[PDB]
From Swiss-Prot, chain A:
The gene is SLC12A2. Chloride 1 binds at residues 18-20, 213-214. The chain holds residues 284 to 1206 of 1212 of the full protein. The chain crosses the membrane at residues 4-33, 34-53, 85-112, 123-146, 150-171, 204-221, 237-258, 316-340, 363-383, 384-402, 426-443, 444-456. Changing residue 645 to A: Impairs transporter activity. Changing residue 218 to C: Strongly reduced cation-chloride cotransporter activity. This is Solute carrier family 12 member 2.
Length: 819, 825
């Protein structure tokens, strides 16, 4: 709504123009020459303008919401890059507050000192002034924000008036100021000052580090507003014009003041000499006064001895002092307002669990910024505070540049910048340049910040995959999931690599959570697991019914650490819903390949037409070549049994179960029955086969299964199966037919006589399980197959019941006959 | 075929004991004290033992077939980490060859200088001898490959005997050597030597950096060999015993030579202090053979000045000379045979395509040449104190990489990555990686910065830029798990906002006959949404699975070749409607489920059997019941002419959303969106301003908007007549025919166009015809025309009539789209 001139340009100029303009720029152009100071300014401008290009490319995506720098970085790029940059930038602003207020306090200290007033000491006076100013600025930061927009332009015009006052006063040389080194545009002085004169321990990159804060603040200005009209258009123009204007002004002032004042001089109005020109080495040869003592012994005034040379050279000192005040305070306030906001946004997004508290809306953010600022203000020296802010802001800018380059390098799903002059290789160059300069200024601090950065990046990317942590950009999650699924579909598995992709169908999802938990146990990071539910009734209400049920069951599953996808369906009967889930559900390679059906607990009482369709589900699944699993219900062991191996799924499942922590204590015992003569050969061959795939200790072989079982179990079988026996032998054929055609689902007696052997052997198998595997936590066998049409459903399920009569947890697993 | 001792212990120990045991360790205990030199040794041992634990953890996994170091790291861990580590380690070994050869040259030139023979200079003589010896080592690397294993134990026993000779000689002081500063185990010497004395500008980490390559060589002993039986058990025990033995010998030798020789001496037996005692302050107060004069000026003998103290204190010097030759040559040969193999294996794996020349066989024709040139270039720097730091740098880089790779793979368990080795703790490995990194920055911060810049560049290039690199390993499990994780993340959070992406199910109904429909459907679902194709299988089930799998394979490879991002979803059913219902109701994994339907226009509905048309109308009705958006497409133009859309009602913004998505694509950018509404003539201005607001809020540009109120006008006679002949074949003729026969015919063919329906909906037909005429007149130039799909309640309308309306609206027109959202915002 603001526009761009009042929304970015003004904000960026007031954030950029800070302490260094009117305090250390003279000192910097004194230490180094005009040439290397201009090179310093150009280096800073190059770093800031490359970062400006990267930011403009960031801000031209369609994600234009919220209104905060961290918001743009997080929503356009990954959450982890967003979090890292947000935290580091928040800290950088928290310390920049201290820098600006310390500069202001130093100015007030000197201003009082030149007068009669004074306090206990310079350093302690700086501490007191900085603390009180920080208190006042924070107090303003939460109340007077309704006036900052009005006062913004006033501050900028006052700052510009101060710059104009300095430049105008430059052109008016006076004899009063001449002792202090202010001569005025003399080619001898320009020649003297053009060369480096690093006097104290400082070097090139020390002055570069002390100056860089003169160019930091491009993001802090406008991007954090994000409430502009057409943010896709305000930011790229505003930032890239603010940078140009500020750099031009900096270079102009540097060259001018370097060409206007001599390196060091004293305030002695005497010392004027015209007597001799013996040496006249100094650039003050016109007079030369007696600055030889100044260069040989300590002297107060000069270019380097005192930093407020701009105050003296100016025509009017109150105006330039007001300029310094405004330049420091505006940027201090901007930083102290932009740090807690990022802290609060980070807390709300809850990227870092330690920072999960927002103080009920953001006392935590203000308290952190205040404590960091006050802690650093206790250092009352500015040439030692400037480098650490330089390091933190180079860290932020390097991270932004590399993040943009990386999001472009990997064709990220939601990275279409739509900007001109944004080549990603330039961004990579900016990143490496920032890192190298960070290291050259101070290698160990750069190392420390970068290990912190890498730790944060890895921690966020990997150690937090669970809930997405309040990410409003669930659209980016959708895009990433779509890309992942597309990539998986593209990858064609010539070898199927059969993984457990279950389709668990039970009816009421919450009736038997035990089956779901057991399925969870062997479906951890190995394959898919889709629930199922067929909903009967009119479609009009059913639409709302599944609309609610999908949500309710999916988050009920999620809260149980369940990787469950709910797949509700509407059908005229259970079999139709089974078919719908069976043939359609599953995208690309995530196609379910196993059907896990919950066993009927009380089929005795329920009408057995339902039994018929529940059993026909087995044939329907088999006809499509689905592995069939049926379930019925650490301290003990496990038992695995089978009569055949078709794909090894029956053997593979317990291996998957044991690998988990809960079942780690449990152990698998092999339980089979083979030829009595070939017990040793079969045992050795199967032990070798298992070893080829899985440790084992014992292999029980029960080759006696062929003979008839005990009388009691057989009897119980007949008193189980009698009610639906055809009675074809007992009744008359034609008389029986009147029941057969209208009741064709009766237990086929002819099958009973034909399948006596199957009944006997399966009953004996159940018995042997009873004696042997009673103590096992869970038992596993191969699910018997009854051919369609040849065998009635009722007989098959009677066989199943006899197989699973009064036993601990029991599973029946048959593979799909595919390797 | 080797076992613990001869397979790992011998190789690791004879690789570890290299050049600095007998050349620089005396000088190291000189520069530092006993305490600080022992601290240096312990720090190097800590770094190397943490790396040994991590290497053991890598080597204890099941991947045991190939038998190679780089093979091992690459197969157990990611291909990107494998490639980075392989390249860095190959370079490190190539430089280590130069180091060991330089040590050999220095020792031999010193020996010759002991005699009359002397080339131009020590430095130049080292240069020449390094050249000849490295070429000889290159020759014997390939020529003498068969019998090296026999000389293995010969060299090891010679080295052991050399150490024994040194330690025995330590216990027999001789008068003739005492001038050279060699006493025997004197307490004052020990007390003097416990404190640091850094003569040159070198500091603690300078001597540490020089010393470190005395502790490196653990990997190349056994991991590179590979072909040793039971490696999973041999490698850990063998390497972690070699480290212990060698470190114990290093501490013993350091403390023994630091407590037995004075820092600086002179080979003159004159001016003993026992005659005249001034202060006796020096630690050599016992004799003080005029060593006080050696403080002012350096001396040719002593513990600091002489780099062959181990050859002086020892008993029989030639044995120690032979020991030095043996250790240096053995380590040099091990490095020179390990490097080319890594280069060749890496190039064969094709991780970095630029290195193509080296892939040539069977032996690498160019890899040996590359390592020979690197070694020959580096040995030209005669000084060894200036070669050691860079080998230290590269080996520290490799060890940090191994430790961090193992830690990361432990943090990201997605691959198999089962260690099975106790003492695997990933926190210890991380600590080792950090220690290596910071210690390597403490030495040549800029060299280490360059090394990490290059390492990160290699890693990023291999992992993200490369579409896929699985030539050796084909786990393909990370993709599955990441896709599953993203799917659950998407399906987990409940968002009240609809988030109405366009999710389209397209049922072409043909095997591959209709590609451009797929292309157009993909244009507006390329990154915004999801696209699922359709295919229904007619026939018996028993042959269905194989045929449909083959069809899926061919169409998927075609889509990959067609650069299509879509999913093939086959289904088996009796008829098309059944398959369509199967796909609509039970397709979609979580939130990635279709919410709109795309159907191909029936070109030959007139000629085709009416049963198909009735089924197709039933398919529309089924889609409507489920509340999905319906898009009917019929027709290749990309940028020739503008795009026109003529919607009369808004249903969730789909009518306006689809054209925007189409325009956003690069190949449609050359066209312009133009709306064409037919509304009240009196309220043209209101309609225009409202639609301008609508487009602005939905972010669409409009060339010009015109409102027409002529829809209500009766259509011209010729169009009505033409529609009459179009509908005549299916006319019911209920009024014209008798009631009884008409009802019988209706019972036989209930889909016949009811005359009552035509009479009732005559207004609908007339408005449709007028709309068709207006579209033909106005939007003829535009390549593609989009408008609302006509719809009526089922039963009250005939399938023939509905299809006739659709045909009329899409008669002799450019690309035509009829869109109707699911009535949801
Ligand atoms: Cl500033
Ligand atoms: Cl060595
Ligand atoms: K600033
Ligand atoms: K070594």
């Amino acid at each position: 709504k603001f526009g761009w001139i009042k929304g970015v340009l003004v904000r960026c100029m007031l954030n950029i123009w800070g302490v260094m303009l009117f305090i250390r720029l003279s000192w910097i152009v004194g230490q180094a020459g005009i040439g290397l100071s201009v090179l310093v300014i150009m280096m800073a401008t190059v770093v800031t303008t490359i970062t400006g290009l990267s930011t403009s490319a960031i801000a031209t995506n369609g994600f234009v919401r919220g209104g905060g720098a961290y918001y743009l970085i997080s929503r356009s790029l990954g959450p982890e890059f967003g979090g890292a940059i947000g935290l580091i930038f928040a800290f950088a602003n928290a310390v920049a507050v201290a820098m600006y207020v310390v500069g202001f306090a130093e100015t007030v200290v000197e201003l009082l000192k030149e007068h009669s007033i004074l306090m206990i000491d310079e350093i302690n006076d700086i501490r007191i002034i900085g603390a009180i100013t920080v208190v006042i600025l924070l107090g303003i930061s939460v109340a007077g924000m309704e006036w900052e927009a009005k006062a913004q332009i006033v501050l900028l015009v006052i700052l510009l008036l101060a710059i104009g006052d300095f430049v105008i006063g430059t052109f008016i040389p006076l004899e009063s100021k001449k002792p202090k080194g202010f001569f005025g545009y003399k080619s001898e002085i320009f020649n003297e000052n053009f060369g480096p004169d690093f006097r104290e321990e400082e070097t090139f990159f020390s002055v570069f580090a002390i100056f860089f804060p003169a160019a930091t603040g491009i993001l802090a200005g406008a991007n954090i507003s994000g409430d502009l009209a057409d943010p896709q258009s305000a930011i790229p123009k505003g930032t890239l014009l603010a940078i140009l204007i500020t750099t031009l002004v900096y270079v102009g002032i540097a060259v001018s003041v370097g060409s206007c004042v001599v390196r060091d001089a004293t305030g002695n109005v005497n010392d004027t000499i015209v007597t001799e020109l013996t040496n006249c080495t100094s650039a003050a040869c016109k007079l030369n006064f007696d600055f030889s003592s100044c260069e040989s012994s300590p002297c107060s005034y000069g270019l380097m001895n005192n930093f407020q040379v701009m105050s003296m050279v100016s025509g009017f000192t109150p105006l330039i002092s007001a300029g310094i005040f405004s330049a420091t305070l505006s940027s201090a306030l901007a930083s102290l307002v932009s740090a807690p906001k990022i802290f609060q946004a980070l807390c709300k997004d809850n990227i870092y669990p330690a920072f999960q508290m927002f103080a009920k809306g953001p006392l935590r953010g203000y308290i952190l910024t205040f404590l960091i600022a006050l802690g650093f203000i206790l250092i009352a020296e500015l040439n030692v505070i400037a480098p650490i802010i330089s390091n933190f802001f180079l860290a932020s800018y390097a991270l932004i540049n590399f993040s943009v380059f990386h999001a472009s390098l990997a064709k990220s799903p939601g990275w279409r910048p739509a900007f001109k002059y944004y080549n990603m290789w330039i961004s990579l160059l900016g990143a490496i340049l920032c890192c190298i300069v960070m290291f050259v200024i101070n290698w160990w601090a750069a190392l420390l910040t970068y290990v912190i950065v890498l730790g944060l990046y890895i921690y966020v990317t990997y150690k937090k995959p669970d809930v997405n942590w309040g990410s409003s950009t669930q659209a980016l999650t959708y895009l990433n999931a779509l890309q992942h699924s597309i990539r998986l579909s593209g990858v064609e598995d010539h070898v199927k690599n059969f993984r457990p992709q279950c389709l668990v169908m039970t009816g009421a999802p919450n009736s038997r959570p035990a089956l779901l938990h057991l399925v969870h146990d062997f479906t951890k990071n190995v394959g898919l697991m889709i629930c199922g539910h067929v909903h009967m009734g009119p479609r009009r209400q059913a639409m709302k019914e599944m609309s609610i049920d999908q949500a309710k069951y999916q988050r009920w599953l999620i809260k149980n650490k369940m990787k469950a996808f709910y797949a509700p369906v509407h059908a005229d009967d259970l079999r139709e819903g089974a078919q719908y889930l069976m043939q359609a559900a599953g995208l690309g390679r995530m196609k379910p390949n196993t059907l896990v059906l919950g066993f009927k607990k009380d089929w005795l009482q329920a009408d057995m037409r339902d039994v018929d369709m529940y059993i026909n589900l087995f044939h329907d699944a088999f006809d499509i070549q689905y592995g069939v699993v049926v379930i019925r219900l650490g301290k003990n062991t496990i038992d695995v049994w089978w009569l055949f191996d078709d794909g090894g799924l029956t053997l593979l499942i317990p291996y998957l179960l044991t690998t988990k922590k809960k079942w780690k204590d449990c152990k698998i015992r092999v339980f089979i029955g083979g030829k009595i003569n070939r017990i040793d050969h079969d045992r050795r061959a199967m032990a070798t086969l298992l070893s080829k795939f899985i440790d084992f200790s014992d292999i029980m072989v029960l080759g006696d299964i062929n003979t008839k079982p005990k009388k009691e179990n057989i009897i119980a079988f007949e008193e189980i199966i009698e009610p639906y026996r055809l009675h074809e032998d007992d009744k008359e054929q034609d008389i029986a037919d009147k029941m057969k055609e209208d009741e064709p689902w009766r237990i086929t007696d002819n099958e009973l006589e034909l399948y006596k052997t199957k009944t006997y052997r399966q009953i004996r198998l159940n018995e042997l399980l009873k004696e042997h595997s009673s103590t096992a936590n869970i038992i596993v066998m191969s699910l018997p197959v009854a051919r369609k049409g040849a065998v009635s459903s009722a007989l098959y399920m009677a066989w199943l019941e006899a197989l699973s009569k009064d036993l601990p947890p029991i599973l029946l697993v048959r593979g799909n006959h595919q390797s």
